[model samples]
Target: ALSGSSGYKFGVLAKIVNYMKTRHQRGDTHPLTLDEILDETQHLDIGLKQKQWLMTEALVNNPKIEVIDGKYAFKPKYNVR
Candidate 1:
């Protein structure tokens, strides 16, 4: 429902969800860890590096993100982009 928040981007959940979907494109069964998720976003334009560590901490517990074996896997909630 909150898919379009700012700049045609989905809210945190949806954006991360869709992003993971794309991340899995290279392989049907690809899964990313917390490090991968956080590391990937380290290059974002909005003070990412500063937010990087904090984001990494929160992402570990993001309800939208799934943690497996101390790693996070992308799960498309509601299966929507």
Candidate 2:
């Protein structure tokens, strides 16, 4: 599984690129305009919002980590630094 903020960014971008690939496979002739892409991305944001909540809960309950200033930080159980 991916870890850290950069991981999350890459994961989301991968999802979008996969979506574009799928559209291409299905013979979506219309070019994806910037506005259309932005509109569709809003739905992705909705899903991410829910995922963020779940991740936050997991991080809070997991003994290996703590949340500091809205970011996940390693706890004593983790030797990340």
Candidate 3:
């Protein structure tokens, strides 16, 4: 849940967001770029249109998280820590 991607209507998008979130929480500051996110999601088996939307709209605009300094930052609604 670190990725907080379940909110996405698409699985691929969630997977990408989750992967980034996981690494981010572990102090992996150099998260994947948009191009890498798209390439990395190749295994999710998503369609072309869906992939683009997820990478652009869903990935960044996702309500579960926020983009801080060009990186995905988790915004825990439960007041984590």
Prediction RMSDs, each to the true structure? 6.0, 15.2, 6.8
In candidate 2, what are the lDDT values of residues 1-81, reduced to their tens digit? 445346444444444445544554566523454234334545334465545643555345645434555544334334323
Best by lDDT: 3
lDDT of 3 by residue, 32-54 (tens): 55565556556445566776776
Model 3 residue 45 CA deviation (Å) reads 7.4
Arranged by lDDT, best first: 3, 1, 2
Off by over 4 Å in 1: 1-15, 25-28, 42-63, 76-81
Model 2, stretches more than 4 Å misplaced?
A: 1-6, 41-81
lDDT of 1 by residue, 1-81 (tens): 656456332244355655666776555435566445544654244355434643565455556566656656665656445
Residue 56 in candidate 1, Cα distance off native in Å: 7.7
For model 3, which pairs clash? none
Please give the RMSD of candidate 2 to the true structure.
Answer: 15.2
TM-score of each: 0.42, 0.37, 0.53
